[model samples]
Target: QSLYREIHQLISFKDVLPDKNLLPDWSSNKNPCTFDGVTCRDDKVTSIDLSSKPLNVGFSAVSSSLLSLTGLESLFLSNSHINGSVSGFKCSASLTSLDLSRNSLSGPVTTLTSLGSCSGLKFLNVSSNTLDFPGKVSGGLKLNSLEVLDLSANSISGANVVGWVLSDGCGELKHLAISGNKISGDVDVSRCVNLEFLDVSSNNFSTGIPFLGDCSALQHLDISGNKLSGDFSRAISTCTELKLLNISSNQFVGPIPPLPLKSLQYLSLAENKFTGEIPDFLSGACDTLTGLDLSGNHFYGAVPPFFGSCSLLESLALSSNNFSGELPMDTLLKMRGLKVLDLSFNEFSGELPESLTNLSASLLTLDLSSNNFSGPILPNLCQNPKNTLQELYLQNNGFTGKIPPTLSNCSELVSLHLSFNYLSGTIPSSLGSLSKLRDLKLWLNMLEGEIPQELMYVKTLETLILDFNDLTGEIPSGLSNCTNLNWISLSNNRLTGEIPKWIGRLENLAILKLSNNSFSGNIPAELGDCRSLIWLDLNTNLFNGTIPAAMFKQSGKIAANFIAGKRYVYIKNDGMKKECHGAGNLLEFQGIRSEQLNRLSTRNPCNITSRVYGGHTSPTFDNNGSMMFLDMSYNMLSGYIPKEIGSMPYLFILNLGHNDISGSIPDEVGDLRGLNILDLSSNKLDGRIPQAMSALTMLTEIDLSNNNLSGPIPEMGQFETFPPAKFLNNPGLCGYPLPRCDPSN
Candidate 1:
């Protein structure tokens, strides 16, 4: 049939675009119904779902070819990297649902006015694009049959788009999401009689809460993340069928309002000015509640014991409040179905209730961190034989004594955070029995003794952080068995012995922080095999050897996704503090208290005052690999700077200061086009500053001070951007920022 041939022709062009064969299953000989993204009804193609195929084609190619089908009813082309003007889209009369969200589509918001002609269209999603409003369109969208409309996360601004959307009437609209835009002014959904869900969150709504004239059928409403105020109770009193209500991150004040949402299953009133105690009426609606978040508020006094009656609650968060005294264990015990409980960042004191372990059977996450809970952690915290507990956070507390060995009973535990506590004694060797443990954090504690070799049994371990402890001993060689180890932070400890060469075998090791240790040996050249090694800090160590050239061998070959999801903070030096040694420092910030950041090390100077760049470190631009930050300063390494360093095109920071390395500066330093900070101070390097350094226009911080370098500093690019202090003590250096060089001497 020509129908099959037309479909095949379209897909072949899409797959062959940019030489990508993402749709190889769509062979010319195969039936259209058997194709990868195609659906058939009565032996005829009816729908297509290519949500993430990376078609890499233009929007016109997709719209013109796919929508031209006679019987096609639905299309899902989200996140396919399709780029083009939205004006090219021309929907068919039979189309009922279309999802072009999260693509690179660009054009005016009015470009969607064409879709109003699809009389049978029921759903439209165009979120997360670059669509904006240049001016108001004369005719409003008239999709009378549209049941759901999602225009979130676009660049669309002004209050005109909202009027245009409802101008054609929202009689059939059941769900409308226009969040993450710049739309402001009043939102009046009085005409939406059938509206059951509305999300106008994260917008420029500074004119107070919306005016939902009538809300009999509304079941979900999210008006959070705006500058709205004024009482919203009287307006929402009619939403009797509401199952979820989120009004967080606004300027609402006074006691939490008593809404008439009888069937509510989820409620979030966090990050507002709501004060005083939570009324017991909230607990009255507990029979239908599955989740409740009241965090980031100023509610004082102890939590009411009546909340335990919320037997149906699966998630409860009351963090960042002023709730004092012991927890109401008697009430909490009744929540047999509770899966997540976060009471962190509060004033709750007293030791953890002994019955806490009884809740572990159905609990998946328990976070009581950043509280004043004191006393030793109970050994029976995981006594339940049927425990399903996965994440346990007890950091930043006054908990003392050794880690309970009985924790090994939590066979399903994936993470255990105990940092910033007064806990002493060695890490429980029994913890090695937790086969599913992926993260074991106990930094900034009084724990001593060597890392137990039994931990090698935890093959799933990814992050092993024991920094700022008195742990003394070599890294266990058996740890190389954990090939998934990504971050190994043991800095500011009294550990000794050379780094194990077996670490080279861990191809996924991205961050290796071993500073402020007594380790005395040569830097292992085998580390070159770790393709994902990005942040390597070995400062203040007793290592005595030459900087290995092999370390930079994998510079251009490492993939960008090695540290994609790892939580980190890279603090760039402002070049204002003379005491600040390196260009910057990359630290593991997850579950660590920012107030105690200075305690990480005696010489730690990177604070929140600097240009702090955080969040999961992931490369979004070019995917070429490079060591982003490498601080090997204050070591005994002695040799020439490896000219192979030029291979790292994405190196952001390079610090090798205060070392005994003595040699001429390598000309390859100019090859680092993306270098942000370069510190080679306090060394014996003697040579003229390379003229090729003019290409280093991206250099923000450059320190060549206390070196024996002699010559005319290149008077171009970023060389003269730094103050004379950065090039101080270099008696032979001369440039514009320094003393002018003599033409004849």
Candidate 2:
């Protein structure tokens, strides 16, 4: 009761108690021992169960006051806001279990020595803190009864950190997790007699698997995501009681050896150099195995069918391997409890079997993409109405035929990716009934005819990719009701009509691509209103007028979300969410609401919504953002690059090639600190290459070819890095990076 009063006063909790309703008397404090989070033994406070509490104070409060509780045996303050160095901790001698995990504690950990008086301390879990150096544990600190010590996710580095804990006299420690740090050193755990669980994953440890020969109590050991390299069989054979072993993403090599761990339940050996064929001994080694992951390895030869004997298996992943031959359908049919099976990126061929439906009752995700599989998909593979299938990926294969409508029976489906196949025919309208569908990709096929209006019923659809097909007709107007649409791609189809103005209503719409279509009209000014618009590609269309001024309304220099330095907001069709080329190619236009527009129209902004009203030229840089590449090269754009482009601090690649841009090279271009590639070739520009370009030390490639410029070229930095071909057609340019002007001329 005294410690509680001291803590409350130290943190000024009384000032905030009225707002938080944390008054002790209001919640039964007649005996003080009956208060919440306070456990009592013989009318004395013995435990403080403040876990998951809104104790918004720091460690100063706990160390200065709460630690004074003489009868306290356990102190659980995990997942609370208590932070700061624990050096001020002056605790009671009877304190035993102290759990301060999942807090924001920072700085070098030197508080372990302060708890020397607590000789009976058994459980000390300080994991998920921000402690830096490996805390020093002085020999004077008597913690012989400590059993579990977890300090994982800290920044403890150096060789001595891991070795200090395994020193002599520390035998009672059973569970030690120091993963997700930069600790690198030789680990010799052969002395930890009672150690059972050791997880040192996601660290910088370069040493081979630590010694576990004498650790008879060892059961679960994970050393993955490190630089540890050695023969797996030699290092892991010592753990006889090993049940879960994960050494993935390490430098371990050589053929996998059979383990004698009969109690093993989970095994993951992914991202290694393990060669040779699948060993048959693994099939019967651990009959209780439930999860196995061996992806990202060099394992070749056909998958062994002996895995069918592992009847308790639930998840199996063999992706990104060199395994050949047909999938073992006969063996998979026996694994009734299997829930996830991923065989993507392999040489597996042959059609899927009808017996695959037998595994559908529990199967949730099945991936066979990027393989040699062919023939029509088995319609009955998921015919069970009660099937739990959610994701079905069969893309990048030799499969041919119309998409089977029977897949709609799996009401739990979320993603159905079947693009890049030889399938030919119109899309099935029944797919629209899948209310849970989020991604529906079917591009690059021979499908024809108008898009089914039934697809508009899928309100949850986020990605609707149908590019490169033979479809013709206006886009479904009902698609405007898809409030969740973010990416819409319908390029290279025969569809003709005005681009739907109602598309501006999708506030979350990011990518809006409608290139290569026959649509004619002014670009929608309301499109600038969709704040999330990014990666807008409308090239090769039949629109004509001045570019809409509203297009530049929200344009401002900002960092590329994925690729740093390169600046340019992307505007992509919300329907093409999954069809966007790369991860970073799409940029989000900022700001717009969904309820503002009707089914057919949107209120235009106060600007002249225009189109390409003149002959096609190159897109001139206007200094809107740090746009690296402006390839209106083949389009009909006419104008000089605005001198304001010189402000782009991180501009690298500038391509104005294959256009009729006629203007003098602005000397302000020298302001770009990170420019690397500059291409103004094949343009009508008639001026000397700016001598200011010589200041660009990072410039490597500069193409002034086929230009009307004539002047002495500046010699410096990348002038020596670039070849003579870049200055070929520029008759007036002469310098060392090119060639000294002929004195005779």
Candidate 3:
């Protein structure tokens, strides 16, 4: 008791409640069992249950004090952050259960061997800790009576560790979890006959899934997220009582396995190379199955209709397959208990059956997108007021019709995606009643008519994408009330009027694409207040004003309100390292390592003129940075090139063409030694070309054309070895590359 008092005084437990008064009675206390988390047998404290007291203290305090409790039979300190190398742990011989899961403990896992002295220990849970090395405990610790052992989420590696644990001595273990480790080898669990639950997922296991053989009691088995291959049918046949089986995200191939388990309730075989049709008898063999996920597989052919017989089924995911045929209406209608259904990225065609309304009472999510489905809009989809629907995706299909007003009845709807379809409709005012609607995507559709004012009532609306439509009239001023609006894509429409100033109130707005509209007004200066704006495509609009400097400041950081799930083009430039890439045409030139530039010069030589013309140009470095090709060419930007741009050493291509930029080229231009293609053409620039320009030995295609530059072009190096078109429209510029300047001039 004095030890306990001393430990409590030294440790900090600001979030956990401790019995401070209990310390007074200390060693003389007759009934220590009367304490809050302590239990006693015959007046001696034998058990302590501190499973979830939020004790934010470490194990050093407990190992130095509490572990010495002579009669302690059980200790539950799970998820309390009591961590470190367990080298000093000591327990009584009567200890049965020791749980210290979900802590930040680190060090060699072999330190757990100290617990081997607890001869009567039966249950041990050290999961979610940072134990390193494989087979660290297999030989050193002996747990003859161990029933449950969890060492998951550690760093165990090598094949020998797995083999040793499943050897003869581990036969008494009923529950074992070694998931999220590095255990790799041939999986053969025939020796673990008493195991009811076994998980070895997220490892480097590269062999066929193990055959359970005589593990009749096995109910849960997961070996997903590995490189395991071969026929799955042979391995799963032994676990006759398996209630849950997950072999997802592996290299498993071959025919669909015969799942004969009558008690099976959950099964996931996603992200595999499995081919062929689903087995015909699957629904009949696993009548108790409730969840089935087979997404990201190569399963082809028509979806089997036998799934209609699964009466207790609640969730079915079959996305990313090669299956083709009409929508399985008959199977869906029979699944009355279905709450979530995903059939995206398939060849399913034809109109969705009106019978889908039958599932309105239970369905929470229905995703039938990216298919060949074609049809008029179903009018009765949301006729039921009790609809539990939260997400409805019918995008990337051939549906054509007006927005149905009846959909307003689905008050619980959170997302309604109908983008990339032929749907032609006016925004229904009734849809404003759906208070929970968060995303409304109708982009690339024929949606026309004025924006509905009532939509402002949906305060939770986050993304409103209605681009590529025939929408007319001004944006509704009332939309400012939707403070959560993050993405507003109203581009390529017939909208006429000034851009709403109220949009500045949307602090979360990241992408405001309003290009190609008939809005004739100055760009809103207040738009600079939107700190999260990333993509601001305002091309082809009649807006006329100076670009805000703040817009350039927001470029380095990712926009907080940017929707990540939306599909966008991603060009992979493995060569670039320092610069970040964007989706559009803006070019970037930043850091370029010297070694990488030398490699590029050797590979892609740029010889503008023949050797007879004395071509001796410096090599061009690769412009592999994030931005490589920018075209603000048609803009009215008139200013001296900032010296800061000279720091862009990776610039291999610079085109400030077709602008009104004036003043002499900065002497800092010589610092762009990586320049291979420089075009200052069609500018009003007038001054002697900088003498530093002669240092640009990398210039292979130089065009100072159509400029009023009055000077002899540099004759050093590659300048004399150039085509006349490069210096053509510059009247007063002359050199050996062209004809010599007039002697009188």
Candidate 4:
């Protein structure tokens, strides 16, 4: 009664009881154990488990309140919204398990002296809190029955805490997860004989090889995401019962350790500083190992053929290594259970395996992208029994010949990427047979002829990329059938036609890029019907017309929350001169064992693509929600700046240079608070540069050069960030970058 009354007074139950319900039920003048979340074996309350409830309060109230439950043996407060210091936390001296995770518990430091009363404590999990651990544990009654102690995601730092936790009344802990709390110095868990699961990843530990001594009962151990260096001769040596081990993202040099396995199932050493050829004894050591990830390492030569001995092997990742020459894929014919094989970012310069159909029965993901593998794709690459193959990535290769028309044979296909290759031929009309297709990336290829009309039959299409090709003709009117179309990039081609009007029907369309083509006509006003249109790139085309005002009328409805469910590369081009000096050459580097790309000058050829795609170490996007990638530069667009565009709350990128657009910049343009990159250079825009545009603090790159604008340039905020080149060649525009302005008095 005392504990419940104190808790009800302290906690603000706004999440569950928004009506400010201070309802109490334990005070019936009867049995207290019969109430909810309370359990009593004898006449006294033994447990109070309010795990999922949102009792938003501080640990100061919680600890003082729990002291009233002197007979409590177990207390569960996981995921409860609690804050403040966890200092005077004491319940009955007979607690066996104490879980208070996912809270905001924090204070001066870790004070474990009061826990001396918990003589029977076993499990203590205070993870995902703001708590801190001062270098050493204070004097306390050492808990001898402790088995599992998870202090993960706290602010615990420095060395010596590991030794104190082990020697401070802890026995052979079955589970010890202290990950995410950074510390330093050597790590030695060999003394723990009864350990099964141990995770100490993502910390600033020393460069010494971690020793998991006497790992007889260990099944899962993760010491990854550290800067541990040196050799690994005694590291994880005696793991007879180990099932999973993750030593990835470390600085460990290898010639990987050759430890024999009993039941080792999954092992990862990805993103390590390992060099040298793979030893032949690695795969043969563990026939029980099913999953192995060795990506982002400096391995050379061919990946070994020893995996042929491991029949039960399922997943293998050897991407981003330096291995070259033909992959000895014939060794993998023995493993019938092989599901995922990623050999991307290597130097394998040969054709795909001849018997690719042999593994099709169970293969789900096959990524041979970024290699020098050249040949015609086997038409029946997805002839699995149940069409189990889901993901196929073969981008950035030298593959030639026509796209296999038989690819539609895979009924269960979801993602198929075959871009950045040398394949030349018309798109297969039979591709519409893939009803489950989501991503169809064939950009930067040599495919020619009209856009296939039958592709609209792929009703589930989301991303349709066909840029940097010799493709001609209009976007098929049948494409309006794909209502789920979100991304469509068909830029830098010899394509000639009017913008299709049926694209307005795609309510889910987010990105529609058709830049650098020969498409000529009026910009369609029906495109404003697309409510989700965030990115609309129609630059460098032959389109001539007034900027459609309807597009800005519905701009208030645009919502951009582009989270990728598939692989995508955001290509950024430096918009430069329209003269023959040209921009940088487009170097197309392959990911795997592919040939070195020649110096591809910025000019285009009739066949192969020269689009350079690089510089992203990861796939992420800007969190600032905006709807402006408008680049209508280098066109013949003759129009006034539309003031209706000011209605849009989200506008980041805008470029309208090298056109005959005649207008004094509207004052409403200053409403674009999120404007980042603005380029109105080489246009006929006249009148004084808008002083209202000076408040655009988000502006990073601006180019107003070669315009007929005449005025004293705005001297504050984003104006001073510009260089003289941005305001050069403009008539009578004088400021800090150009020169000090003469007053107009």
Q: lDDT for each of the candidates?
A: 0.82, 0.68, 0.69, 0.72
Q: Candidate 4: where is the Cα deviation over 4 Å?
A: 1-54, 60-77, 89-98, 108-121, 135-144, 283-285, 457-459, 496-508, 525-532, 553-558, 564-624, 646-650, 673-676, 697-700, 715-745
Candidate 1 least-lDDT 10 residues: 599-608
Give the lowest summed-lDDT range of ten residues in model 3.
586-595
Q: Please say which candidate is ahead in lDDT: 3 or 4.
A: 4
Candidate number that wins on TM-score, 1 or 3: 1
Return the clash pairs for model 1, or none. none
Candidate 4, 483-543: lDDT as tens digits: 9987888887788888878878888787788877898888888888876777777777888
Task: Tell me each candidate's TM-score.
Answer: 0.89, 0.75, 0.74, 0.85
TM-score, model 2 to reference:
0.75
Best by lDDT: 1
Of candidate 2, the 10-residue stretch with the lowest lDDT total is: 591-600
Question: Which candidate do you rate higher for lDDT, 2 or 4?
Answer: 4
lDDT of 2: 0.68
lDDT tens readout by residue for model 3, 333-361? 78878999888887788887878788767
Compared with the true structure, model 1 gives a TM-score of: 0.89
Stretches off by above 4 angstroms in model 1 are: 1-31, 54-71, 80-94, 281-287, 562-585, 598-622, 674-677, 693-707, 711-745
